[model samples]
Target: ADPKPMVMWKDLLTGSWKGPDVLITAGRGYACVFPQDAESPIWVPDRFIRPFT
Candidate 1:
């Protein structure tokens, strides 16, 4: 079976939130793209990184 897909949000250092976005496999591990800038994607954990409303 295929590995289960993961989900996450783009928690910004400037205090802006992005998603409930889907996480995709990267060359190093896993990542999600920045909604505003495709070239500026960020890597994140498979589990919840922090609390959100």
Candidate 2:
């Protein structure tokens, strides 16, 4: 099983998020990263996400 990829900041100085995030959607060189127990998913560039491998 390819458990969802974890959320990571593209730029160290740009933003911050905590534990086991959820990647809701991924496509077209972009992704939507849902925060840990948050209501809205934040948009992040595909480059910001690392594969589950």
Best by lDDT: 2
User: Candidate 1 regions off by >4 Å?
Assistant: 1-6, 26-37, 45-53
lDDT per residue, candidate 1, 1-53, as tens digits?
A: 53334344545465455564434554344454444346665765434333323
lDDT of each: 0.47, 0.65
Task: For candidate 1, report its TM-score.
Answer: 0.33
Provide the clash count, candidate 2: 0
Which 10-residue window in model 2 sums to the lowest lDDT?
Answer: 10-19
lDDT of 2 by residue, 21-47 (tens): 667788898987777666777777777
Q: Which regions in candidate 2 have their CA more than 4 angstroms from the true location?
A: 1-5, 9-19, 37-39
Per-prediction CA RMSD (Å): 6.2, 3.5
Which candidate number would show the highest TM-score if scored against the true structure? Answer: 2
